[PDB]
């Protein structure tokens, strides 16, 4: 029971639960670069939030944000495919991603992924300590003080091992499954990057912030 956690981590999980709780044709594209705008917003909340986040550099708090964001896009699509969108339109959300331009080549990966996920039944927690696990990665490009985002990673890292245990005692590679999603999730940032020149040279136009925080 999460009577398993210390006092701390109790408080560390509630904090992090309340953040993470208080988030055609041409046209398609349009709905989708919106979306991902007021994700955007939303995540930019829930990073500022983070424990011991204010306590690194601004440049590297920047970093962080920008690095993580399409992750944690797809990661909190993920979350919205099984834990949200029934079942029966799952289909139907398919077929307009296709319509908006972005080929069944990089729509496919996506899709398996979000079953993917589905299989490992991730509670909520699971998904809000991922995610900000995702966020405070150390090893993201142009971060100098790797170390201390190692630091602030490491205790959201315990926590959620301690969920794993919790929730599937029974299961004890489930941590390591999660760990395995994680890397799943990484391609993605090539997946985008492939379609975000693509989109640039059929002249997609974006959003200042998406311009910026997807360096198009
Ligand atoms: C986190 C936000 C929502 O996701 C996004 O913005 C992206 C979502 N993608 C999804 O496959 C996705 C989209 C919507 C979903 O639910 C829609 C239905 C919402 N339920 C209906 C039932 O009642 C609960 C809410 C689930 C997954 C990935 C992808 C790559 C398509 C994409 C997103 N934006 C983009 C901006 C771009 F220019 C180009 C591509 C994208």
Redesign the pocket.
Known sequence: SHGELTPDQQTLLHFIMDSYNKQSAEEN?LI????????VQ?LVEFTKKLPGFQTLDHEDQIALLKGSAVE???L???E??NK???SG?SDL?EER?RN?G?SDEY?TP??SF?KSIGELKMTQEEYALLTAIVILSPDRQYIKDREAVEKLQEPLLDVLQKLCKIHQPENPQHFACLLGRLTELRTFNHH?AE??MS?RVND?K?TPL?CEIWDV
């Open positions: 594209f989708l670069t919106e979306m991902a705008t007021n994700h939303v944690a896009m797809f909190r699509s993920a919205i495919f949200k969108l029934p339109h959300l991603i908006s972005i729509i996506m899709f979000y985008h379609m975000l989109w997609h974006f998406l």
